[PDB]
């Protein structure tokens with residue numbers, strides 16, 4: 001839905017690296033190289049960012065219910 | 068196959084079965100049951116008058 | 119002798135006779151319909 | 164006395180248990196109750 | 209027959225928010241008639257005006273409170289010393305009428321040679337406002353108000369989608385009837401309405 005704050009397995013803060021990851025992917029870096037640049041060494045933390053699906057972007061396309 | 072008659076026959080028979088549309092669309096502006104209830108009301112009124 | 123109403127037939131969603139067939143992606147969102155929904159069912163009651 | 168919200172144009176109004184359930188401005192037939200005023204607390208866990 | 213005091217006029221204060229809440233009522237024309245409300249002169253010292261009536265002006269839709277608050281109602285009022293003026297609803301202020309404002313209004317009435325509204329008429333207006341505010345609308349009245357605001361509706365996403373769907377249904381009816389002239393006009397209208405972002 002939205003990027004988790006902490007890694008499930010070890011608890012490293014990964015919630016501040018989503019926009020930087022998207023930026024690095026925009027510049028043309030490979031996903032593994034982008035994860036290396038963000039200093040995500042353990043594959044438990046790499047799984048968190050590599051397999052995340054951003055569903056909040058779809059939820060935000062519906063009109064707000066209160067104004 | 069390359070004969071013009073065979074090609075024209077194949078084209079005609081292929082495009083003949085492509086056209087199939089019987090039902091015609093329409094736009095409803097009011098309640099479809101309005102006629103039934105208004106005619107039932109008129110029939111009940113004339114039944115009372117006839118009685 | 120004119121059009122007589124003979125009944126109401128339930129409509130299968132996303133078919134040629136459904137209202138959502140034409141709607142594009144934006145109006146589908148405005149109609150509170152999910153774009154991932156595929157249709158193929160009826161809504162009875 | 165009780166606040167509501169329209170399901171289409173998100174307009175706020177009130178009802179007195181005697182008006183028809185409708186939106187005032189756009190006439191939608193679907194309305195939603197407003198959130199309460201009581202205190203809401205969560206344990207962040 | 210007794211003169212109306214300040215509190216009697218304060219009982220019948222009808223704010224701009226209340227006006228927006230009640231301007232579309234059919235009885236609101238007679239309700240607002242003869243009422244006294246604070247008005248923004250603009251040229252600003254606020255003054256009191258007497259409502260001689262109301263007149264709907266088509267094509268003069270104006271923002272009442274917000275951008276979506278389109279209104280066509282206009283109020284025909286008149287200063288005593290000055291002449292008749294047609295003003296929109298948002299010119300009035302929700303703030304209460306002050307003592308020098310009412311005193312100046314009384315002096316203008318004395319200069320013109322007019323009197324103040326009777327206490328019986330003040331109570332009649334108060335009962336009229338309470339009945340109108342506590343009234344329960346009927347289905348036909350609600351539909352009439354909705355149609356009136358739809359006529360006032362410049363644009364609304366839900367209504368545009370509904371209109372486009374109705375136009376598509378009319379287009380398929382015209383296509384199934386082999387009407388090559390109507391379908392071109394409906395396609396042109398859809399092209400004009402469409403091209404969203």
Ligand SMILES: [Zn+2]
Nearest residue numbers: 007010044045
């Ligand atoms: Zn980890």
Ligand SMILES: [Zn+2]
Nearest residue numbers: 169172186189
């Ligand atoms: Zn509404």
